[PDB]
Amino acid sequence: STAAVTGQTGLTITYPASATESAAIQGTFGNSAAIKIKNQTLTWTRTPEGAWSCATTVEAKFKPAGCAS
Amino acid sequence: TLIELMIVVAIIGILAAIAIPQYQNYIAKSQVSRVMSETGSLKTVIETCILDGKTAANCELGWTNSNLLG
Structure with a gap:
């Protein structure tokens, strides 16, 4: 429900406390997700200067062009 | 006349000595042919269970008894 503590176990919020550290929104697959990608995760990170970017550990053929990093 | 009767008996020997081809190939192939369709x-169903992440007990099968256990 908040950045510090969330209502879902697979989602964690990395809230920065200083002006020189980044923010991250990490989402880990599970439950209804595919068994192949059961233990993988996708994250959205924000640099201090205000740029958002996406990254994921899933296989390349499962990566769309949006998070092809 | 004893000549017609032996001809009949010989022809009986000709026909009743019919060579039976090995039909077991057909029955075994067709029986397997049905099984692959059933399997x-x-x-x-297995893939949909797999892609949804369900467990072994959570995968409901619409499988029914068939004359071949396979």
Whole structure:
């Protein structure tokens, strides 16, 4: 429900406390997700200067062009 | 006349000595042919269970008894 503590176990919020550290929104697959990608995760990170970017550990053929990093 | 009767008996020997081809190939092939259809129909059920992340007990099968256990 908040950045510090969330209502879902697979989602964690990395809230920065200083002006020189980044923010991250990490989402880990599970439950209804595919068994192949059961233990993988996708994250959205924000640099201090205000740029958002996406990254994921899933296989390349499962990566769309949006998070092809 | 004793000549017609033996001809009939010989022809009986000719026909009743029919050579039976090995039909077991046909029955075994067709019996296997049915099984692959039965086993292949569960592929979509297993995959849908797999792609949804369900467990072994959570995968409901619409499988029914067949004359061949396979």
